[PDB]
Amino acid sequence: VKEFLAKAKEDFLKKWENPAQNTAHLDQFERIKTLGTGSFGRVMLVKHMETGNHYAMKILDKQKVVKLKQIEHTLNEKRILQAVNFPFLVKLEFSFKDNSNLYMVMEYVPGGEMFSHLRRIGRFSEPHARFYAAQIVLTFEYLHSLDLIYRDLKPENLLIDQQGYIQVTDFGFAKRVKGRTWTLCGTPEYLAPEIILSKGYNKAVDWWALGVLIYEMAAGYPPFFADQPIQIYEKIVSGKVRFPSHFSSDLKDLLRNLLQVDLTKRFGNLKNGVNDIKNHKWFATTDWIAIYQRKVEAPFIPKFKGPGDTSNFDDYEEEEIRVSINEKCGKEFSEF
């Protein structure tokens, strides 16, 4: 492992210090369908004409990014994405910008969001949740080794590929930091107590989110929910957590330590680092090397009738992509 990480850091650093830029143009892609929409951007399925490949293109409106004060976060996302490489991270193929928008073309994962699959089936068995959770463990080990904090873990940001393995996406909040950071960001149900209490936090928040993820995958609902964010935040800091009857004794033990309101003893943030997680009873049967190599039998293989298929994705209102004849926020995004 230490051997693997060492070399991984070498490649990341070279890219991190000399980020690729303007590697394509909008007119080289064919717009196919909208796969998701947010407050400042959208993701569309596109077809690259030269190669005949299908990709997921994330389009961000520079003006809306500025209004929402996400300029630095957007620069963080692209600079980090063009520099990483791990089997469980969706690959960024190209990036560019024009007068109005920022563009990030990633590899398309036709399988769809874990979210959609999880909700339809209710809950995943423990071996099933363990298989996915293990992939997040190694992904976080990787990211963290590079001083990167993810901060956006949730079923909505995990895609399932043709081999049945997970592909993490949405690096909108990813940041390279040594020491503490303070930005209030994330998703209610997944926020660590440190974040809600606004008191400087570190990568420990990612491990906490893993705790929430495993619980939701195995229960069918998150450990902390309510119709109002305030109500949700009260439950998270309370230091109280209830576990379904079917949860194994080990799983409940793995979660007590992960969803530890005292981040100075929360698994992942201890002297043993991630090993307190990897060597835990609930993972006793996991062959970590097997997971990274993808030689483990997937619990479920999504289906598709062909490349370009989008049935594993919801339908979204198709809006037009406009590009003003005037540059909009040049300086703010010069390094993109």
Partner: peptide
């Protein structure tokens, strides 16, 4: 059941991120 309360809540759809 907690499962029922969850499905009946307004938090079963895609959950948006926060910051502001």
């Amino acid at each position: 059941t907690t499962y029922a309360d969850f499905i009946a809540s307004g938090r079963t759809g895609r959950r948006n991120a926060i910051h502001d």
